[PDB]
Amino acid sequence: DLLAHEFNHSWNGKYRRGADLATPNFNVPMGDSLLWLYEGQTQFWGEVMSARSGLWTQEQARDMLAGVAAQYERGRPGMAWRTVQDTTNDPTMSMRRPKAYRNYQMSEDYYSGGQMMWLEVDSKLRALTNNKRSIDDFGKAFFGMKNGDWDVNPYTFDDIVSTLNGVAAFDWASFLRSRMDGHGSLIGGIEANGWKLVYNDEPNLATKTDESDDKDASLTYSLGMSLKASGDISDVLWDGPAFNAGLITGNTIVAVNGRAFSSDVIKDAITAAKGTTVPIELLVKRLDRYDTVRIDYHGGLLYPHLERIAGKPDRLSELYKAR
Amino acid sequence: ATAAPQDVPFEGTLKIDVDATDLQHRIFKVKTTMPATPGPMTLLYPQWIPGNHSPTGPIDKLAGLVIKVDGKVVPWTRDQFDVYAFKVDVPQGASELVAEFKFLSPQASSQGRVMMTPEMLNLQWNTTALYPAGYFARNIKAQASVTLPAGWSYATAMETERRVGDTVTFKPIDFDDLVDSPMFAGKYYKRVELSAGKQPVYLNVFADEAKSLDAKPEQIKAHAALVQQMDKLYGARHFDHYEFLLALTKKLGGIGLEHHRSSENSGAPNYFTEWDKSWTGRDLLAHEFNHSWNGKYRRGADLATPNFNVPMGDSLLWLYEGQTQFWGEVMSARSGLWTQEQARDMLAGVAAQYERGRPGMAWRTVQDTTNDPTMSMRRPKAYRNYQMSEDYYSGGQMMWLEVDSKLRALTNNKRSIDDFGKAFFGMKNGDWDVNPYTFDDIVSTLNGVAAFDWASFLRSRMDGHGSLIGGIEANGWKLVYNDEPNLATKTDESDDKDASLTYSLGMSLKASGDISDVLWDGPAFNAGLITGNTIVAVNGRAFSSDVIKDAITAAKGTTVPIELLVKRLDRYDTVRIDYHGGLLYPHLERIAGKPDRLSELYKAR
Ligand code: NA
Ligand code: NA
Ligand SMILES: [Zn+2]
Ligand SMILES: [Zn+2]
């Protein structure tokens, strides 16, 4: 999706840019307040255009989308105190330097969190117009002027609202602020467009590809952590089971129920603990000390997928379909 | 299935020509030439090698064998019931047989000890020889030659006839003495005189790097003192000259092999340059030198076989190796190769090995361990402490210490084991032909020093299951254990940060935590631990030698078991060891009331 993503920026980001971002030279500070359009909708179009162009299969794009939806339904506990709007300050705050909890500190969520909101914007435009308008109409109206022009054409927040209102009348200012300044769910566009985010033990296509050769283990929605093949913990979900055992990134899972760690071993132990009352025993190395923790997790392996809601119209497939 | 060797004359000379230039492949190319007698002929590759007491002949490393009679190839047939025997048919009217082959020396330690390096090589003529069946080996006149890597020096007890370029031709010699006359060769060589006179002794040092050859005067003196101290003991030398062969190396395979007029010895590159760190192995040259008397000159009758392809009887190895192990350590102290404190702590370690480190003594005798060379071939065994392993060495050493103490008690300290050595090995100065003995000869010579039922004494120790360390207390000392480290153990575990815990937790460990040895019926054994398991943590803390030792001390006198996190194959478990005795290392302490005969024994004469 990279080339689709970067290409879309020629319209969204380069040609049209937030007025506080379009600075007069390279040595005055940049205002990032509208990055949830610049990068957020480009993240959205990058994945949609990957499916429309055939760079991704339709199944690949849908599993990609399921991972994003799960990230904000369960993988971002930092939503409770921080808004997506505040993450537009992350480039200057963090400069992508290592942080302990991307899931709790949050990290440039104007990308994927913005993508979810633009998916909901598409679903709302369809609902307001009986599917006669969609986010495609916003794209043409907001970026389709002045063919050949590649000088910056700045915009403000009110311009976004006005263009959205021109596609379909609605209090878009309140809608945008409620998602971007709020702490609530961002994934409403999934169900509105006819699908549902579910979790089961079948691996997500994206996660499966990203953990095949290295034999890593992404267990975000089960044990609340990710591990390298060595057993080194690479990420811990805030308030998750691994977190509640005091585990941090850099600790090592040495053994699972007494058996030397492997990705298959810890996954099999999670499956074996599903529905039982026998805790999973993890032998842990913390710096130069070893201890055993008992984790009472019995939900089994949980990987995100999208499933159809049979009665509802399938607007999502229309959105991801080639034009 | 090979006809017995006969004490009949062998007509002619067996010529053995070796090309030792292929250092890269580590190949010795060989040409053996002999008179060809018409009719069936059987050629033998040496199988039982003197000094190894076992069939160590590397038959599967003999390759490329082609046999020609007067230039014509003759097919050979190996005896399927004697794989060291090659049979050919020699036509009528033939004159000369030539066998050509290659000895493919070890390319890694897994094939045996390495014999060739870019800087040095070790030529053992039994690996590069074929000889006719049916003859006593001593009746076969032989003449050897070797082509060396360009410009290399060499050393051997065998007299040189001529060196032409890099081809050294040696003077004719009996075939059994040829096998007994190994050669070291290398580019970094130093020859040091240890004793002048009519039966001179020299030390030949080869090294990986020339800097290792810088032996200091006081260090050479200790080696010269070894020769003088052996003169005091035996009063005779069983050689016309003696050539120590010493390789200071990390590349050549380790070796300690005795011969009549030489010995093959290996040491670390810091044998001289770090004299204070390399002391634990310095009894080697004293050990091998003593064998020139005890083992080479005098040998058990069942061990002195007529050729290299009939089995050897090892029944009397507790004199061959046992008393040599004894004199090796005693002479190290007498000569100054070891300090008296180092020799005393070495002896304490041996005594503890048989007081507490050999539970296998409950079922097996030291006499039975004389079969270990052929049973085990020094291959890995799980419990050297319970299966036992060649205890005719150190167990024999303790008996000879008790023999010494008994000789003193019987004679009011006027006689000691020194008198046995002179009486049993000191005859016929200059003779280096084998002078065999039997068990009755040992008893008779001991009885000549001091009358006693030595037959019962020897049999009760070597066929018994009781204590072997009685000579310690009889000679005025007592074996004790405390938390003070043994000098040998400390030196042999330092730098690597290893951990010898035989007398506390009953196990030894590498710095990694891998268990390297487990004492039968000890605390680690009783937790189900075996060699190859890994101690991962101690009381929850990542393993180190210091960590486990501090935990042993912390567990002393308490009832809180030591918690060891253990890796067994792919499984982790925690064991609790209820050991509360603390760290225990063996030492010798004086018995105030008794005379100190031990210091007399270890004192220079
Ligand atoms: Na421009
Ligand atoms: Na001889
Ligand atoms: Zn971008
Ligand atoms: Zn020996």
Automatic annotation (TrEMBL), chain A:
Its main location: cytoplasm. Residues 223-288 form the PDZ domain. GO terms for cellular component: cytoplasm. It is found in: Cytoplasm. Zn(2+) binds at H5, E6, H9, E39. GO terms for molecular function: aminopeptidase activity; metal ion binding. Keywords: Aminopeptidase, Cytoplasm, Hydrolase, Metal-binding, Protease, Signal, Zinc. This is Glycyl aminopeptidase. The chain holds residues 304 to 626 of 626 of the full protein.
From TrEMBL, chain B:
GO terms for cellular component: cytoplasm. Residues 505-570 form the PDZ domain. Pfam families: Peptidase_M61, Peptidase_M61_N, TPR_3. GO terms for molecular function: aminopeptidase activity; metal ion binding. It comes from the Bacteria. The keyword rRNA-binding does not apply. It is found in: Cytoplasm. Zn(2+) binds at H287, E288, H291, E321. Keywords: Aminopeptidase, Cytoplasm, Hydrolase, Metal-binding, Protease, Signal, Zinc. PANTHER family: GENERAL RECEPTOR FOR PHOSPHOINOSITIDES 1-ASSOCIATED SCAFFOLD PROTEIN-RELATED, SHORT SPINDLE 6, ISOFORM A. This is Glycyl aminopeptidase. It comes from Xanthomonas campestris pv. campestris (strain B100).
